[PDB]
Design a protein around this ligand. Structure first.
Ligand SMILES: N[C@@H](CC1CCCCC1)[C@@H](O)CC(=O)O
Ligand SMILES: N[C@@H](CC1CCCCC1)[C@@H](O)CC(=O)O
Ligand SMILES: *[C@@H]1O[C@H](CO)[C@@H](O)[C@H](O)[C@H]1NC(C)=O
Ligand SMILES: *[C@@H]1O[C@H](CO)[C@@H](O)[C@H](O)[C@H]1NC(C)=O
Ligand SMILES: *[C@@H]1O[C@H](CO)[C@@H](O)[C@H](O)[C@H]1NC(C)=O
Ligand SMILES: *[C@@H]1O[C@H](CO)[C@@H](O)[C@H](O)[C@H]1NC(C)=O
Ligand SMILES: *[C@@H]1O[C@H](CO)[C@@H](O)[C@H](O)[C@H]1NC(C)=O
Ligand SMILES: *[C@@H]1O[C@H](CO)[C@@H](O)[C@H](O)[C@H]1NC(C)=O
Ligand SMILES: *[C@@H]1O[C@H](CO)[C@@H](O)[C@H](O)[C@H]1NC(C)=O
Ligand SMILES: *[C@@H]1O[C@H](CO)[C@@H](O)[C@H](O)[C@H]1NC(C)=O
Ligand SMILES: [Ca+2]
Ligand SMILES: [Ca+2]
Lengths: 475, 475, 475, 475
């Protein structure tokens, strides 16, 4: 009967489970996590390396930021001491091409006008807008240095980042694997007094490769100067398996690889017919979209993965191998996006067992009610969220004052979780203003943390304590 | 019907919601938070800058505190290297005037008398009292240096601060934008061996301005020496939009600005008639004051905002522009106070939706009981508070011993929350006395943290679990 | 009626409440907490002061510990630069006498015998026992340096401390306010190669005084070398009001001071008659001992406070004023003990209102049951405590391995609270042994932290949820 | 009756309780914990000792790792300054033999093949496999330096460790108590340019001894280079009582020692007969295995303790006393294993009272149901575990990106507890990708931390709240 029907497809759920797992398990062995950090903090948490404390992760001063140029990543991304040309990485990994420096810039004399201080100020700079977007050829002129290029002139898109979240390319440079002039560039950038005053965001980005497990990784770096005059740096990192081709073990992963694409293809159409079979039948059912969420999810990876990847990998052999540098980013961006959703699927992919693990017993029948009576969870979720946002908002306004954790308003929505959990650096909140707001801190941790608790749990308890009688009303 | 009546005013609640939001959203864009810290820790967490560790945030020794004078904020507040006079702020923001140094002092030979140690002690100094308040012209005399001035002789009020919380001006100085003698002052203050021995509180305060978003900010600094001989420093920071006038975007914010003042003006009178309509009708109703709390709240900003601000902004053009320095503080103090309450309103302003969001369903009817049966929350709140204060008190007495987090008795009321939440630095509590009090720590975290839990939650649970039957008794 | 009877004594409870408060409030103003730390970390967290990192709070090496002698507390306890003799404390507080160095030592060749390694080892040293207690006159002989003295030969007792917890005086020295030879002592202690090899505990202790608020404080320092060869340092600090006499404000505190001693004296006898009136009547009543706990508590302070204090304060004028040093310690030890219990009373003193605050309403009647039905709290308290001790024990055994927070078995009973609360430094537990024990960590935080929760709260809930019906059965 | 029967054996449970305790109490006094750390961080958290920050616990660079050779443990394990040869360890403990350096290595040109980059790469190295295991005699040849030995050629086994978890000995060296050439070895290892390029794991291990309490301890050190090119170091530490023989107090511990071996021997057989008496009788009983778990547990220590130990201790006198070094490790490995389980028993040993403590009252009868109705705990434990693993898995995949605490998949199962408890370093999770995944963080701490709570507690509550009526149905 159905025990033949479902377990058969359940077998498909069983085996194909390991398949994508095998891919993830195969494409990524456990050590890949190390391969991030071990390959990271050789740059990030490495100091400025003057025999001075501060790292990249803490940078402040403008000119200090060239002490990042000279003495951090420059000598960070390295040339090796062994003794035609042949350049590896710390004897392990593999460099390719050479980074592509980007930046931003805006029209001078744009905005920020004091009316009567025009004495003191001849010109000013406002924030980086959708209208900022302005292109200064003005020298000192060596070639590129002043050359604007649109980001359609370049190939990939821009970067997202926290505050902006924009697209544009102010200037550009392709770096030099030669350690000689890559500093003399900067020295010629002294000759240019470099590229920045009111510069918002500086991009120096590239990507590289380990030889051993052949895996590939991207270096995307973000240094924001918000228009108020500050310096906020950050990072971006993604690993990559560049070609699904493996010179050795591909046909182990390529074994099941071209297999599943028609496997799920069977899953594709079968419920599509069930869409017009059941239209409102899955409305209000709440067992519906989740099952078919994967459908959208799956194809997204499926469709555009090989579509983009198998395309450009070719020239990646060529535009790379010459000292010139191929942009892999936008491609990688997809891999990221790929990696992202593919994982996000894995959950729902995984939890496909969650419905499968229990057909067994009263156990299986009771969780049906669990969320079915959890409808209330949605009811007072809001009053929390508001009151949650409330303090957060209030926090924003109140604590827009000096404090971290706060007042990039989104982050205040997290730091409003982070507290009820813990870890808070509280010496700052109080020392903001000795009345203000620590009462807040008291209020919230009083109110929320006392009001929030059981309004979960009772509704968890009651109907569940009700499911006992409600499982007693079958007996 | 009422669906026309309320939603119409609800529309007013809807739109006017965004209005004050727009102001806050408009007067403060998100980055203003950075504009605090990015502009702060260039002073606070910056070291003493001798190539020595300690910052301002950690200061201890008396003479070290002049290593704050020379090598911290002095060179902190800066003169720029570009090449008549033209001085900008790190190329971004804008200085104005020059700081006004203040201080305190007390009569010598006042109090602190050992009877038989008068051998060892000729004179002494007690705490800073309401009677301390005493004025030493005694030299070395250059002009101001010994000149007392009352704080009515000066313009603004004093500062609050933690332990004192007083008003007075011991001496005064207007600083120099010239970096030359601003040290030679201190050098002439070496010639005066400066101003301090038993000095309680040293004020060096001022305020400045960003050019870009035109926003304005105040620098209020507090260094307390409590009479026991110690050194406790701190800070005070508030941002400002100085003139509601904007040379560019004012009429965007001035669009709705003069609009709402008569908008809420409609709200003003309408319930005032409802006060004599319903007198005791809102007594015991508990739906009453909160609705009309805003009323007091609103006008406070409303009335005195433009009242004080629009006044003095004029001379702020003049007394500023000469090398002499206008006090903006007391004004700013209001802005703070302004900023403070205006935010505090926003909550209740915000939560005005909290009653509005739910007219919908049984959801709306059940929260009525939520606090209505929460009356018990007030009942055993006290026994906690006492027992809370109890340990805290006990903590005060017990841990008046060396420890932080404790024994400025108010702060012990927080550190009595901070623990049950977490983060405690516990190596100190035990190491106070190996019996004493870690049993306490055990007791509390045992007792409270076991006794406190459900005495919330049951009362949360029960009556709520009772609201089910109590929502079942409508069905 | 009784409303005249109780409130009258309640008035006594009301007023006399503030009395002892006033004492504590009067004897200790809030700033006294600072007066600890501000006066402390000028020694503790101050580095070794070579321009080297480590402080006293972190000391390790034997010889490094003389870098504590020379360059920490020696120059810490200071002589002032102002210009017969006249020496103040940083211009504020007041030194008295000069510290009394103590130490320990044990018989050589006592124990620790490898049988076949007697080749390698001629002599050894075991732990510090009740039988260790052995007295080496052997030189190099200058006078005291080798002179044992019993602690009855000296005046006060010994110190408790963590591992030992013993009494004895190995050697002694009275220090020198002269900063000259106090180092040359140590230099003559180089001439003696100092006093230590297998030395267990080194005591350098003294006490001093602030002039301003006249308050007094004790410096008791502990450096343990456990016999395994390690170095564990620590501190001891207590503040003091030395004479209840105040040269100025005494008669404010001496106002109510001689008042209360006969006040409570009224409380003394009145229930003593009630002891033979009610013998078993207070048995099983559980309202009994707590009320009369204070009785023991009160007199303890009462009796021995002035008994010891008023005695020795006399010679404290004399044995102090000569360059020789009076031991105040044992006296202070009582003050500590005094301070300790007097505070401990204050709780029960305080909570005397806890019964008083509620005679009011059903509120007052329901908490009667609260602990009355809390009898169960004692029932499964044990199973926890065992299982608590269980893991702790298991922790001890398991984690007797390198780790802090653990395996001084008492401390493992705290670190078994500390986790369920939080803050754990967990990188150590796992990295102990990669199986061992992090499963433990999992188990406990699973088991306890899931099993412990509601077994409190249900028993809190149920009977309380039962008190509703049990308060419904009066209605 | 049985009160004579059980309490008699309960007496045996009572007394024999202290016996093994006495052993543990006797074999290990409390201070042994210190004897770990006090003897540890003289190596671990000691810096590289160049007057540079980083310790062993933080090592990164390859060549830096010889700054561990030269300037850390080399001079760490020390030769003493007192004035034939006579070498202590800080006048306290005792060295023996001299460490045995080990390492690993793999075939060159094995794997890691880029197909078209064979231009850039002549040879490569893949991970350390079960097939890696390859033996390079290639020079520069001095004797051992290139000599492979199997681990059966050596005596003990290999080490477990985190990622590998393997067995093999690449090369070997016996160190020198002479501090002269032990560096010149390394200098001759400069002459050999040492032993490493693609080296996975470097073992330098040994064990030593305190003279005082005669206790013994093992030094097992692990430095992994995973094949991606990174550097992860670590430690291993176990204390030891080497011979149960004590030159002094043995016959105190040897008093009860040969006593219990026949004591439990009585316990051995008595239930063995009860196995065939009751076969399925203990099936489903759930009171069964736990009681007899100790049985397996006990003998494991019992059997192999003296079996291995009493054997090799002999030659430990000899192969030690010559400058050559006996391997004690494998022996110690058992001690560890011994120490481990013996402790693990102690729990169940301890909790033997847990059944014994309560025969008393209704208290004793109610906990019977506690787990008896806890059967549900197993029911939704899974849905958690999955959903637990789910996010963890998702975490792995998502956060295989740079982060700690994560993506050695096992560790993500802990860091999935660690959060709900607390302490998280959260600045990394968000800053991974600003969308990705902090929503996750939100989700989990929302979902789990709200969904997990009462699904414990209700099931704890309900049936317990049911045990009241279920204890009311006896009355
Ligand atoms: N007040 C914000 C919009 C409201 C509309 C009602 C629902 C909630 C959101 C508005 O200030 C957003 C902004 O100014 O950017
Ligand atoms: N005992 C304090 C006053 C009491 C009165 C009763 C109610 C509680 C407060 C008093 O010590 C306050 C002070 O000394 O500053
Ligand atoms: C361009 O760079 C060269 C150095 O490579 C320098 O000599 C020259 O002056 C620069 N010219 C401009 C316009 O920057
Ligand atoms: C070798 O390096 C030089 C400069 O370092 C570079 O210009 C050249 O392109 C490299 N050779 C090859 C074949 O890539
Ligand atoms: C005042 O200051 C000047 C230096 O500007 C110094 O020469 C003079 O001695 C000072 N006089 C007094 C009374 O301080
Ligand atoms: C220029 O600087 C001098 C000293 O630094 C100052 O006195 C002067 O007022 C400044 N010029 C103007 C126009 O403010
Ligand atoms: C005693 O100390 C003096 C220095 O004050 C020194 O010269 C003398 O040798 C010492 N003698 C002994 C026995 O220590
Ligand atoms: C002054 O100091 C010396 C040494 O520093 C000391 O011996 C003397 O007793 C001090 N004077 C008085 C009056 O105590
Ligand atoms: C062996 O070591 C010695 C130094 O002890 C050195 O002189 C010799 O060259 C080395 N030979 C080899 C093959 O390593
Ligand atoms: C003394 O040291 C040398 C080298 O340090 C060593 O070879 C010798 O064996 C040692 N002496 C004894 C007796 O072990
Ligand atoms: Ca918690
Ligand atoms: Ca119930």
């Amino acid at each position: 009967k159905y025990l033949k029907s479902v377990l058969r497809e359940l077998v498909t759920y069983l085996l194909f489970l390991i398949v994508l797992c095998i891919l993830t398990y195969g494409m990524m062995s456990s050590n890949v996590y190390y391969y991030t950090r071990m390959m990271s903090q050789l740059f990030l948490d490495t100091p400025v390396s003057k025999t001075e404390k501060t790292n990249f992760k803490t940078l402040s001063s403008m000119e200090d930021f060239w002490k990042f140029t000279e003495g951090s990543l420059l000598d960070g991304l390295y040339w090796k001491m062994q003794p035609d040309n042949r350049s590896f990485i710390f004897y392990e990994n593999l460099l390719l091409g050479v980074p592509r420096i980007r930046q931003l810039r805006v029209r001078n004399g744009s905005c920020s006008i004091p009316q009567d201080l025009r004495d003191e100020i001849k010109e000013c700079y406002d924030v980086y807008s959708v209208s900022s977007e302005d292109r200064a050829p003005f020298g000192p002129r060596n070639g590129t240095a002043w050359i604007y290029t649109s980001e359609k002139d370049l190939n990939g898109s821009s970067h997202w980042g926290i505050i902006a979240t924009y697209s544009g390319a102010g200037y550009y440079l392709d770096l030099s694997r030669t350690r000689e002039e890559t500093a003399a560039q900067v020295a010629s950038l002294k000759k240019n007094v470099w590229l920045d005053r009111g510069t918002r965001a500086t991009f120096i980005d590239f990507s590289v490769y380990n030889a051993n497990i052949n895996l590939f990784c991207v270096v995307r770096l973000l240094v924001e100067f918000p228009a108020t005059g500050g310096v906020i740096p950050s990072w971006q990192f993604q690993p990559l398996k560049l070609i699904r081709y493996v010179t050795t073990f591909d046909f182990f992963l390529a074994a099941c690889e071209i297999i599943f694409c028609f496997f799920i293809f069977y899953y594709v159409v079968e419920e599509i017919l069930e869409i017009r079979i059941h239209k409102l039948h899955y409305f209000r059912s709440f067992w519906n979209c989740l099952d078919v969420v994967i459908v959208v999810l799956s194809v997204v990876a499926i469709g555009i993965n090989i579509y983009r990847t198998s395309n450009v990998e070719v020239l990646l052999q060529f535009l790379e191998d010459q000292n010139t540098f191929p942009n892999f980013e936008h491609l990688a961006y997809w891999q990221i996006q790929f990696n992202n959703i593919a994982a996000v699927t894995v959950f729902f992919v995984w939890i496909k067992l969650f419905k499968f693990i229990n057909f067994n017993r009263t156990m299986s029948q009771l969780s049906t009610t669990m969320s079915r009576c959890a409808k209330d969870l949605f009811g007072f979720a809001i009053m929390f969220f508001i009151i949650f946002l409330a303090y957060a908002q209030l926090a924003y306004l109140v604590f827009g004052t000096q404090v971290d954790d706060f007042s990039t308003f989104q982050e205040c929505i997290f730091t409003q979780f982070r507290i009820i959990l813990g870890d808070i650096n509280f010496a700052e909140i109080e020392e903001a203003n000795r009345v203000l707001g620590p009462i807040y801190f008291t209020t919230f941790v009083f109110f929320m943390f006392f009001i929030l608790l059981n309004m979960f749990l009772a509704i968890i308890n009651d109907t569940y304590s009700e499911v006992k009688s409600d499982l007693a009303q079958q007996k």
